[PDB]
RNA sequence: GUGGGAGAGGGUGGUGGAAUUCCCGGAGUAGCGGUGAAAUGCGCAGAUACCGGGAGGAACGCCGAUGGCGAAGGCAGCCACCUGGUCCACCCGUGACGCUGAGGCGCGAAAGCGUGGGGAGCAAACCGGAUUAGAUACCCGGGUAGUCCACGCCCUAAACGAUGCGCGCUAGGUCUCUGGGUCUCCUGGGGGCCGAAGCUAACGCGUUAAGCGCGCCGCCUGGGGAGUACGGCCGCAAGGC
C-alpha cells in the first residue's frame, strides 16, 4: 500500500535456507519470505522447491504494493538459489537484472573449524 | 580453453610502471576488479609481476577497483 | 536383469476385439493359469457393461484404465540417512502394468458376489472417475506431489 | 673494485580496501540458526534478510605458480625510511689472505611463562544441546586462557630433503626463475622432472648424488626398561640439556 513498482530483489541462498527481501529503488524492505516464513521447519526449509515458494511468496506480496520489475542480487550459494532466481522470472514480475554479489573477504578472519581444512 | 586473446598482444607498448594508466592498467582486470591471471594478460612471470603493483598501486589512488558484481548468473 | 534391458513380451490379441491390452486385462483376472475362467469373466462383464450401459464395452474398458493410470508416483530412496520418498514420473509401460492391477485389485474388493459383476461395475466406476481403482491411483499422485520437495533428487 | 639485476630476506613508521562483530538510523515481519535428523540458542524490548552511518580488532582475496627470498626457524595488501644476503658482466685491484670447526656466543615454529596493553573473529578448559548401550568424543549453541602488541623468559618439534659443510671429477634430455651474449640458442646462478656410468637390501639416488675422491665437524653399536633414575647445569614455572 504506496505502489513502488521498481524495486530490487536480494536472494539469500545457504545451505540450510533461502531467504527472499524484496526492496524498493534504493534498498528499504517492502516484504520478505523464506523457507520458514511457509510452511517447511527444518531441513526442508532448504531445499530448491522452499527456494521456489519462498521466492513466489516474496513476489506475490510484493506485488501488492504494486511492484512489477526487479533488479535480483544473489548472495551465497545453496540449496537451490537458481529455483529462487526463476520463480520471480515467472513471478510475474519482470526481471531486469540477476547479479551475484556474494560477500568474500579478502582473507580477514579466520572461519569457524567446520569452515577451516582449507590453503 | 582461454584462448579468447591475449590482453597484451590486443595492446600497445605501454609502460607496465605506470600506475595511472587507467586506461591500459583497466585492461588486465577480470569483469571483476581482479587481476587476470598470465593464461590471459599474455604477461611473462616479470611482466605480470610488475603489472601486479601497478594494478594495485591504482587501487589505492581510486583509480581502479578491488572488486566489482557480477552481472547475469 | 544386470546384463540386458529385458524386452516386454508382446501378447496375442484378443478372441473377439483382437485388443492385446484386453489380453493383458485378462492375464491380470487369471489364477493358476485357469485361462478359460478368466476369459469368461471378461467377457460376461462386457455383456454386462452392455445392458447396465448403453455404450460398447470396449470403449468403458480403455476409458477405465485410462482414469487409473498414475501419472506420477513416489519411490523410496536413501539420500543421507533417512529414506526420502522421491516422486517421479511413471513410465508408459508401468503406467499401463499398475492401471490393469489395480482394475482387478479393486475389483476383487467389491461386495457383489459374482466375479463377472465386479469387474463390470468396477470397470464403469472407474470410467465415470469413482471406484476403488480410481482411488489408489489419485491417492499415489497425492503421494508424490506431497513429497515434491525431496523432488531435486530427481533419481 | 666498477657496472647491471631479481627477490613474501629483516627492522621502524605509515596507510588501502574486502569481510566478521558491535553500536546508531532507516525501511521491514515472524522467524532466524543449525543437523543425518534434531535440539540448545537467538528473535514481538522486533531478530533474520535489506539500505546508510560509525567504532574496533585481526587477516591481507585476485596476481599466486608447478614461482621467489633467507642459515635455519621462517617470510606474501600498498608506501616510505633503515638494513642483510645473493647472482651476472668487465677482468681492473690484493696475492693463498683458504676449508672445517670441540667448547663459546647468537638466532630459533607452536604451545607455554612474567609485567603491561589489546581483544573483532577463533577457541584448550569450561557450560549446554544432540548421538550413544555409555559419549567425560566426534556433530550443534555458547565460552575463559590463548590467539594480537610491547618488554623480558622458555628452546622444543615429523626444527624434514627424516640427506652436516667445502672443493674437484663423472652422458644427456626436458620444463622453469633470474643475469649476460654475437638472443630460432649459447653461457652463469637457482628451482623441478626424466635418465648415462655408477651406487643401493630394495625402494630409489643419479652435475640440486644417495656416484667417484679429499678435508674437517656431529652422531650410531639389538629390543623393552627409558629419554626413565641419580648427579650436575639452565629456567619464575612448566620444564630443558
Given at each position: 500500500?504506496?505502489?513502488?513498482?521498481?524495486?530490487?530483489?536480494?536472494?539469500?541462498?545457504?545451505?540450510?535456507?533461502?531467504?527472499?527481501?524484496?526492496?524498493?529503488?534504493?534498498?528499504?524492505?517492502?516484504?520478505?519470505?523464506?523457507?520458514?516464513?511457509?510452511?517447511?521447519?527444518?531441513?526442508?526449509?532448504?531445499?530448491?522447491?522452499?527456494?521456489?515458494?519462498?521466492?513466489?511468496?516474496?513476489?506475490?506480496?510484493?506485488?501488492?504494493?504494486?511492484?512489477?520489475?526487479?533488479?535480483?542480487?544473489?548472495?551465497?550459494?545453496?540449496?537451490?538459489?537458481?529455483?529462487?532466481?526463476?520463480?520471480?522470472?515467472?513471478?510475474?514480475?519482470?526481471?531486469?537484472?540477476?547479479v551475484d554479489?556474494?560477500?568474500?573477504?579478502?582473507?580477514?578472519?579466520?572461519?569457524?573449524?567446520?569452515?577451516?581444512?582449507?590453503? | 580453453?582461454?584462448?579468447?586473446?591475449?590482453?597484451?598482444?590486443?595492446?600497445?607498448?605501454?609502460?607496465?610502471?605506470?600506475?595511472?594508466?587507467?586506461?591500459?592498467?583497466?585492461?588486465?582486470?577480470?569483469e571483476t576488479?581482479?587481476?587476470?591471471?598470465?593464461?590471459?594478460?599474455?604477461?611473462?612471470?616479470?611482466?605480470?609481476?610488475?603489472?601486479?603493483?601497478?594494478?594495485?598501486?591504482?587501487?589505492?589512488?581510486?583509480?581502479?577497483?578491488?572488486?566489482?558484481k557480477l552481472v547475469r548468473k | 536383469?544386470?546384463?540386458?534391458?529385458?524386452?516386454?513380451?508382446?501378447?496375442?490379441?484378443?478372441?473377439?476385439?483382437?485388443?492385446?491390452?484386453?489380453?493383458?486385462?485378462?492375464?491380470?483376472?487369471?489364477?493358476?493359469?485357469?485361462?478359460?475362467?478368466?476369459?469368461?469373466?471378461?467377457?460376461?462383464?462386457?455383456?454386462?457393461?452392455?445392458?447396465?450401459?448403453?455404450?460398447?464395452?470396449?470403449?468403458?474398458?480403455?476409458?477405465?484404465?485410462?482414469?487409473?493410470?498414475?501419472?506420477?508416483?513416489?519411490?523410496?530412496?536413501?539420500?543421507?540417512?533417512?529414506?526420502?520418498?522421491?516422486?517421479?514420473?511413471?513410465?508408459?509401460?508401468?503406467?499401463?502394468?499398475?492401471?490393469?492391477?489395480?482394475?482387478?485389485?479393486?475389483?476383487?474388493?467389491?461386495?457383489?458376489?459374482?466375479?463377472?459383476?465386479?469387474?463390470?461395475?468396477?470397470?464403469?466406476?472407474?470410467?465415470?472417475?469413482?471406484?476403488?481403482?480410481?482411488?489408489?491411483?489419485?491417492?499415489?499422485?497425492?503421494?508424490?506431489?506431497?513429497?515434491?520437495?525431496?523432488?531435486?533428487?530427481?533419481?
Amino acid at each position: 500500500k504506496r505502489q513502488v513498482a521498481s524495486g530490487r530483489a536480494y536472494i539469500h541462498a545457504s545451505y540450510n535456507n533461502t531467504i527472499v527481501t524484496i526492496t524498493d529503488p534504493d534498498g528499504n524492505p517492502i516484504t520478505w519470505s523464506s523457507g520458514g516464513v511457509i510452511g517447511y521447519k527444518g531441513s526442508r526449509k532448504g531445499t530448491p522447491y522452499a527456494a521456489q515458494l519462498a521466492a513466489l511468496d516474496a513476489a506475490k506480496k510484493a506485488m501488492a504494493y504494486g511492484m512489477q520489475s526487479v533488479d535480483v542480487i544473489v548472495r551465497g550459494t545453496g540449496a537451490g538459489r537458481e529455483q529462487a532466481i526463476r520463480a520471480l522470472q515467472a513471478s510475474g514480475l519482470q526481471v531486469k537484472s540477476i547479479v551475484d554479489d556474494t560477500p568474500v573477504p579478502h582473507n580477514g578472519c579466520r572461519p569457524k573449524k567446520k569452515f577451516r581444512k582449507a590453503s | 580453453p582461454s584462448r579468447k586473446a591475449k590482453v597484451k598482444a590486443t595492446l600497445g607498448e605501454f609502460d607496465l610502471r605506470d600506475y595511472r594508466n587507467v586506461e591500459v592498467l583497466k585492461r588486465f582486470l577480470s569483469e571483476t576488479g581482479k587481476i587476470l591471471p598470465r593464461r590471459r594478460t599474455g604477461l611473462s612471470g616479470k611482466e605480470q609481476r610488475i603489472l601486479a603493483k601497478t594494478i594495485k598501486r591504482a587501487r589505492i589512488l581510486g583509480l581502479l577497483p578491488f572488486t566489482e558484481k557480477l552481472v547475469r548468473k | 536383469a544386470r546384463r540386458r534391458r529385458a524386452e516386454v513380451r508382446q501378447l496375442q490379441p484378443d478372441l473377439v476385439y483382437g485388443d492385446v491390452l484386453v489380453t493383458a486385462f485378462i492375464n491380470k483376472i487369471m489364477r493358476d493359469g485357469k485361462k478359460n475362467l478368466a476369459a469368461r469373466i471378461f467377457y460376461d462383464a462386457c455383456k454386462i457393461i452392455q445392458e447396465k450401459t448403453g455404450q460398447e464395452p470396449l470403449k468403458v474398458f480403455k476409458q477405465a484404465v485410462e482414469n487409473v493410470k498414475p501419472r506420477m508416483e513416489v519411490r523410496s530412496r536413501r539420500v543421507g540417512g533417512a529414506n526420502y520418498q522421491v516422486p517421479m514420473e511413471v513410465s508408459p509401460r508401468r503406467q499401463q502394468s499398475l492401471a490393469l492391477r489395480w482394475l482387478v485389485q479393486a475389483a476383487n474388493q467389491r461386495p457383489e458376489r459374482r466375479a463377472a459383476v465386479r469387474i463390470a461395475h468396477e470397470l464403469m466406476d472407474a470410467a465415470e472417475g469413482k471406484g476403488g481403482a480410481v482411488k489408489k491411483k489419485e491417492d499415489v499422485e497425492r503421494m508424490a506431489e506431497a513429497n515434491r520437495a525431496y523432488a531435486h533428487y530427481r533419481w
